[PDB]
Design a protein around this ligand. Sequence first.
Ligand SMILES: CCSc1cccc(-c2ccc(C(N)=O)s2)c1
Ligand SMILES: CCSc1cccc(-c2ccc(C(N)=O)s2)c1
Lengths: 546, 546
Amino acid sequence: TLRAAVFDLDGVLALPAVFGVLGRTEEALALPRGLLNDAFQKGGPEGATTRLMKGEITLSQWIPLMEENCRKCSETAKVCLPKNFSIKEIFDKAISARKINRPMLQAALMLRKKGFTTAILTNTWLDDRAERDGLAQLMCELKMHFDFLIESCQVGMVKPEPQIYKFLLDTLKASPSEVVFLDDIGANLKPARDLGMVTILVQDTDTALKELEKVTGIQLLNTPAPLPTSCNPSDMSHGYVTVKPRVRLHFVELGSGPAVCLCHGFPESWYSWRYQIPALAQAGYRVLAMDMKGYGESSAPPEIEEYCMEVLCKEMVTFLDKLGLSQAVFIGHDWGGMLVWYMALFYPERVRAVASLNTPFIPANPNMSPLESIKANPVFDYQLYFQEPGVAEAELEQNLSRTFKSLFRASDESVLSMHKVCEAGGLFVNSPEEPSLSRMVTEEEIQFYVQQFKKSGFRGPLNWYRNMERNWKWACKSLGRKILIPALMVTAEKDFVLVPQMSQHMEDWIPHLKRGHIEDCGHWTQMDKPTEVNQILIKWLDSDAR
Amino acid sequence: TLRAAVFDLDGVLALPAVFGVLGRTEEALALPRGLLNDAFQKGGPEGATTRLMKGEITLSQWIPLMEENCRKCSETAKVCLPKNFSIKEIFDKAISARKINRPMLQAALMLRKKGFTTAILTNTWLDDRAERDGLAQLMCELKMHFDFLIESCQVGMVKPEPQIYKFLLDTLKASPSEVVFLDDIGANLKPARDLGMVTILVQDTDTALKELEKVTGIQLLNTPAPLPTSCNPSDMSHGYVTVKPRVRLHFVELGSGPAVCLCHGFPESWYSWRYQIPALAQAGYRVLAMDMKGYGESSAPPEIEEYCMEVLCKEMVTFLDKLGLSQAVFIGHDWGGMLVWYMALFYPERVRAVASLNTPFIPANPNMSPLESIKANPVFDYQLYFQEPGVAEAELEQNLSRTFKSLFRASDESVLSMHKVCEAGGLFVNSPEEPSLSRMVTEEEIQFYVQQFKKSGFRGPLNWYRNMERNWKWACKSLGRKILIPALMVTAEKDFVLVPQMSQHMEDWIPHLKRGHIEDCGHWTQMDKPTEVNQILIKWLDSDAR
Ligand SMILES: CCSc1cccc(-c2ccc(C(N)=O)s2)c1
Ligand SMILES: CCSc1cccc(-c2ccc(C(N)=O)s2)c1
């Protein structure tokens, strides 16, 4: 019975296989077949290449030795290599052209999800090239999906020496018969077999995967579209900034590049962005996923006025100041979407670009009380239920598990009326005591929100809805302004509270506004439609926010 | 008696004054004197400009209104503005050319150091230009040196309206007679005077500063070269990454741009880089100042082997992995300098560039025990004293204040022999019980190190010296490699343990090595010579590490 799967990198997890480049070069250059290859394998286990693969020497030290091996192979072949022939130029292109074999990685991900221990076993080098970052990025992306990364140059052993195989088994804490080994070089496969390991000679991916499926009894080919990579809270970098005495803000941080500040809604967490954080960091951004004030590890002061838009926005400016960030892209959802439009209106200098999911930009009506305005819409009755300090806290803090399971559901899973909530006397008066688990979330993900909300509860979060009058007076000062910085409005077809239609007049105040629309998407946009959210955000980021 | 100083931005804290650009444009373009200016001030407190300054409108909305005011001023003047005349192009250059008036900022810094409350009072706008970041960066740099930043567009009032002045006094919690006010516009000075505030009409900086010195009784002109900006621990962003079960690494993070990872020595803190962090972030870098393993808020496991170079380097690679960083520039000092050379040797893919202060790169002697090697040098006797578990911990943990005050001293302040330490039976056997405070440090800075070392003490830090044999065996695997990535070696003339001379053969293993040398610098390089360290690092960073 298998419980571990090992993958080679070149020709297995990454394609096109860098080594099939020596043959491609020979042909393009009309060189005697195998000339370049002979120079690469020259001296076998004594050669420059074996020294490189064992980590005795770096790639930059190896390049002159390989080109030297190239003169000698020519001497004995009778043809003379050109004057612009560069080993470096050839390998630079080969490394650069090699990308992750996505279906192979998905198969490895699926096996690991089923309780398999996974690893990468590769003959690689210590890359000190000026262009080494491209491969460092690839290895970074690949490795975090595996239990182990065994690199020849770091262990001082190479495939096919039998010692690396005994090393592999020891690392795995498993006997050979519990291991599948995939490689594109039959010579490297043989020792794994001699030990009783299941092996797969990898040529075309589909066939290798057909073989893999058969031997594991796990479906790997033709499976449904997987979810984007999520976040494990304990594997993240956690950041803490004191924005004022007794007000500290917590954030999760991932990646490098332009700062993208993600602002969640009610009643959420930095964790609501779990499917966006790895994807946005991978797309070349420095992600800062906040626990907004009143939430999770961020401070939660009791006073209502601590949660008015003016105070919240000023604290987000200080956050940027203390981190030494002159700007950040601000991406919000629900209450975070509202904050994000106000950051653009009041601090355009600090906002590189602004994007909102579900939350439209509606300019304050100076001739109408914001309370009258809320009453005009039956779908906002829940906001009136939230007005009285203590009432919604009591219901929401009553049973945390029920609260999140009741709220976090897809559009075709609704359990909450949300209309005539005041008259019903609560949000959960029609709701089961033990709601079923929505297909959107795991039991574990619910438990994370439960644990977060045990610290401060619902007072601070609910206080965001308790500053209507103050926010309205502040917003009225911006009635003559327009939003002229890059902006994106993303609507969710099935959000029955923040309906797409409510966003229709936005072009009047944001003339250059760009849009996104997600069909069959409820209110919890990020977890309902992660793939679509990621595609829309990344595309908008690359085109409008460097 | 004064206790508060207020500065205007344009023409006072920032030069050349953006508004003296309308006159410069008129001349260069041979336009009737004051034509452009009339268009800027048009309608006075009713005009487009006053609306802009009060925050009713953004700069992008204002530009067409100002150019419109330009057609009208021409109608009545008889000349016709060109076809490539751009209000935007003019203001873009003016904003861009305006820089901090460094001597004015130094004067404000000196006053604040003397217990003054300082503030910036400015008539500014809400900048939504595509080029708004340049000014956002300037305001960011400037503001962190002041107690308050009062911007007209954010308060909805402007100079010279008397309400902003009453607002200023209220913000300051001070009566007018306790306030000096500096402005380059006499009209804005008058109301401050009418209230009894001391005023200074600012033309040339030197004279304004001569006036400021007279009225405060504090020397501001011709003062010694100030120290670079330091760090206040509670104003920093604190980061935490679990690199393995029960091993967490703490870091302080400042700025945006390429990741620069600062690695302190023995027995230090992230705080040893206090003078580098603001300077490097200001130079366009994302600084990650570590608490190395065994130190401060980082985990400190008791086992010796937890501190061998191989384990430490692997944990720094995981740190990068968990933060989503494919690379970082690694800058080390003392033990951190040693780690940093080993990161370059073993993980060149993860090291963008490598720099060391005082610590040279010495390749392991495969024909000699590292213990024999240490014994060959009388200056390394302290390392032998550190070998026995418990002995150095007892002496060092005995009185924390004495420990740091004894260690942290300039070269001409030495109190410690450091030679024949074993035979003397300690580091502090000749040292006073109550050492004087070195000119390098304040009592407060000592107390910070004392507080940090109360958590874990000296076991983990001392364990860095307890892996000679393991480090030697690991290092021997790199004997065939060279360091071919960008590298900087900084020597300290008066470091009597890590003498500049010990670095003389480095070019043999790092052929492209760049150098820095600091005269009259002891072992504690960063606090001994902050200005020189910063100049050397920034210059090397901008030229060799993007
Ligand atoms: C009150 C939490 S914010 C909000 C806004 C719009 C729709 C929703 C829904 C939450 C839960 C729903 C359900 N029935 O499961 S609909 C929540
Ligand atoms: C033992 C701490 S590491 C080190 C290396 C080289 C010189 C120094 C000095 C520390 C303190 C000195 C003194 N006498 O104040 S010299 C420390």
